[PDB]
Symmetry: C3
Subunit: 330 residues, 3 copies
């Protein structure tokens, strides 16, 4: 029958054009794939001045709000903090969150099993006029974290400019590429701000723009902390010129339900010696967690993958043909 | 022949059941898989008081033993340390390990080729009553680490509550998930401790439990340090509800031969200015290394993978047909 | 025809030898592969003394030039720095590169839009005898990074030694391996310098050797910074003894155009309280970025992969035979 042969030839032509357009053209089967070796360096330029009650104006610079000063990929930018100054190890009332005592017999000497704040001395001392807390041995000023300033202490963090420098190299092809691609110039790096459409190649990122692109409001996130994931994808083709290869930036927002564990926070201390006594300043920093992830591959023409793809296509064709023949026979 | 046809039909039904079951349900071929983007946030609540001979009581809060303050995925929990206080730059004798001199002519001015402790002035000074070491220009006094305390200075950290906050997002499906799940609530985290069977979803991990579940003993590991690897694996079947998505926590113990470089250790310093002179405190910290590795995939029903799996199954059936026909013919 | 049968048997023998040798031995189809869990700990030893104008001799020990105390995979080794001692908050002139005014009416009170150095007060005080800049609120000694010392302040960094301790474990096969191998002993590490041929397995890497093997000159890197990538690769056939399992160390040079953003740099501050006044020392450190990446796979004989490979080979054979038969059939 003529129509049977027509259907067979149509099926073989379909599978042939499918394999040819997909394995070779679409999926780049004639190009080897390798993995980039990458290193990310980050620099933040911004300044914010905080004026808390009872304290002088505090100037925060790049060394201050960037705790991973060595330019790590996973860095935290300080946006809100609680400062407990002049902490010294001595005996005083603990925080009321741990426990509340009405008499000295209630307190027991030892360490708390859950959320230990210090070594209990077994004495109940008044934390303030109303309630009393068991006396512990720990840094004496105990941070009350219950009050979270509604206006962010560093609401200026939104405009802080952020520069990301990424250098990727493929080992098998011995090709090195950097984010600061050709189009970028020193003059450009002075007056550009990153945008999804306007300035895709500008390496200077605005913190507020990055947060808003992820899908989070900067103010509410800075009030309680947050996590933002920036991914740099280097899809590269070596058959073309290296100028074509460029870094694509994608912003991903990592969030969670606000009732439980809202935002991101950590505690850090600055140890110093004043008047011959060792003292420290405890800070509970509510900041936005920025993670840089670089994943990419390079493709360059090679003879062995081309021959293997040709053989696989011939095998798939010769199969499809025998399968169609057996189907038409039965 | 009847028996030949029966064997042929049996082989056909067997390969049909195989291609309809294995690649579809077991391998989830109709689903497509996307790697997660994740961020690790770790908070350790605990307090340990270390009493050292010649020094006052030392309180080590969360910021102290957790050296990475920004909540990095790889963090070290301090278990034992060697403290050398009041280090100042000057000319003081070197450690006996570097060299032993009996006369001033033996010492050579310059810097030692390997593991230099300072700039040798060229004079042999008595390090102590018995042996003499060449004078060097370095921090004073030089740290001595020949003796490691057999009882861990921080042994209370066996009980330290470790809270891991891991937020994942799949870019292909645009679904954000966190280690905290609907089953876990605010009242649950107050008293729960992670267990392999009892509390698999509790985000609070005990350090001793993590060490014991990794095939290591905390008591022996705390003396010289160690490396414990925690892997959080997410397997998600987006065909079901998102409540079924639950993280899987696996603890892997990374250990080596005790004879050659046992445990993990590092040295850090705190710089301060006392009495108009720059001084520092050098600590040789023996701590357990914790690495959080999050690797997972999610699968949702899609039309193109389903069609590809159907085509692959039909192709496998076709050849299982002829392979059987050619064998029965022989 | 006899020639047709000879050609058929020749093609049969060719495809049989192929499916018996290539996929089995070269591809290790009978073995299974699993990803390892790796944690890297780095330790450096070396001392460098920097003598500056006015300031006394400064000793930079391991804790100084190694900014990551814990020793993460990504660490920076200080080679050159710019120190602005005794930075105290107050009113001072901004940097001349920021802005220059001839009259006080030029500057406007507020915060700069880009790269803010402080809060302008609307007054112009002379930065030096020639030009005058806007008066800002912040650290009084402004850091001037126009002059970079051509001789590296820490050129002694080239010969500093680097010890890398990596422990890898395959969870599927429950086998733990370390960079320290049976060939390496305690007396060997005392004097081993890593080399590609002479000493392949020693974990003591010379910084200058690592920089030179990556393809970069240390002296140029020392002045303005650099990036060096070290990759450890483990390929182990668990069918043989575990002694054969040895890591492979490869150095990759990550560099970019020197005209735009040459080298790697960052700023960190040391906060201290002297004379009841909070001051800091700001250092602009030019250092070489070192990144450690570990990847590997292991192979163990298993029954299911062997059976799957045998089935795939039989299928490829059965197809090749008939495809050849159709070829002759024409
Ligand atoms: N976060 C940022 N925002 C805006 N511009 C930046 C940022 N980081 C770097 N740049 C600009 O990019 C150029 C090249 O960066 P490079 O690493 O040389 O910084 P730098 O010149 O050492 O820093 P500085 O400008 O503080 O001296 C610099 O001229 C700098 O002005
Ligand atoms: N390591 C830990 N051990 C025990 N409980 C913890 C731990 N980390 C967090 N929690 C509990 O989880 C709850 C939510 O924590 P969240 O991430 O909101 O930090 P936080 O409440 O701002 O910090 P803090 O508890 O210091 O106020 C807290 O009420 C706390 O009691
Ligand atoms: N960067 C390095 N260069 C040369 N030798 C090193 C280096 N790091 C460690 N070693 C040597 O390797 C041996 C085993 O390493 P290990 O991790 O036990 O160091 P350690 O003995 O704790 O350090 P230290 O020698 O400061 O006590 C040590 O005897 C040490 O001398
Ligand atoms: C005392 O502290 C407790 C802490 O919960 C608080 O509720 C109470 O209002 C305080 N009382 C005064 C008078 O400040
Ligand atoms: C950021 O700068 C813009 C002007 O470009 C200003 O309107 C905005 O208030 C600034 N951000 C904050 C919240 O300080
Ligand atoms: C600077 O880079 C931009 C990139 O958009 C380019 O358009 C411009 O021509 C460059 N400047 C010079 C002087 O080449
Ligand atoms: C002196 O120091 C050396 C260091 O190895 C030690 O062996 C010796 O016992 C010490 N002698 C005294 C009297 O402390
Ligand atoms: C808290 O979570 C636990 C999970 O084990 C659950 O059993 C309990 O009902 C929850 N509490 C409330 C009030 O729902
Ligand atoms: C003053 O500072 C400017 C800053 O660029 C410099 O160009 C100039 O040479 C300096 N003048 C003197 C006398 O130091
Ligand atoms: C490093 O090389 C040799 C040791 O091999 C040493 O003598 C020389 O002084 C050093 N040079 C530098 C640049 O530190
Ligand atoms: C130390 O290791 C080296 C490896 O090159 C080996 O040749 C030597 O025999 C070892 N020393 C001892 C005492 O076994
Ligand atoms: Ca890291
Ligand atoms: Ca101080
Ligand atoms: Mg609280
Ligand atoms: Mg030692
Ligand atoms: Mg500059």
């Amino acid at each position: 029958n003529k129509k049977v042969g027509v259907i067979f030839r149509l099926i073989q032509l379909v599978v042939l054009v499918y394999v040819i357009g997909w394995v070779f053209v679409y999926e780049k089967g004639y190009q080897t794939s390798s993995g980039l070796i990458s290193s990310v360096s980050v620099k933040l330029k911004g300044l914010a001045v905080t004026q808390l009650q009872g304290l002088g104006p505090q100037v925060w610079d790049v060394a201050d709000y960037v705790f991973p000063a060595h330019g790590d990929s996973s860095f935290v930018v300080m946006t809100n903090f609680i400062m407990t100054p002049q902490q010294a190890q001595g005996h005083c009332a603990e925080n009321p969150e741990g426990g509340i005592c009405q008499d000295d017999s209630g307190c027991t000497p030892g360490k708390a099993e859950r959320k230990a704040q210090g070594i209990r001395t077994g004495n109940c001392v008044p934390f303030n006029g109303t309630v009393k807390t068991c006396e512990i041995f720990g840094w004496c000023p105990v941070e009350v974290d219950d009050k979270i300033p509604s206006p962010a202490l560093l609401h200026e963090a939104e405009n802080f400019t952020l520069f990301i420098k990424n250098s990727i190299s493929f080992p098998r092809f011995k090709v090195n590429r950097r984010n600061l691609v050709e189009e970028v110039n020193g003059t450009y790096m002075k007056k550009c701000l990153y945008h999804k459409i306007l300035h895709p190649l500008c390496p200077v990122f605005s913190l507020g723009y990055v947060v808003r692109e992820s899908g989070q409001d900067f103010r509410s996130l800075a009030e309680k902390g947050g996590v933002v994931g920036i991914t740099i994808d280097w899809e590269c083709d070596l058959d073309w010129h290296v100028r074509h290869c460029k870094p694509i930036y994608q912003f991903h927002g990592l969030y969670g339900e606000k009732n439980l564990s809202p935002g991101f926070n950590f505690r850090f201390a600055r140890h110093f010696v004043q008047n011959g006594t060792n003292r420290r300043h405890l800070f509970k920093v509510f900041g936005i967690r920025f993670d840089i992830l670089v994943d990419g591959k390079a493709g360059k023409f090679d003879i062995i993958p081309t021959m293997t793809t040709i053989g696989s296509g011939i095998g798939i064709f010769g199969v499809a043909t025998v399968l169609c023949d057996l189907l038409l026979l039965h």
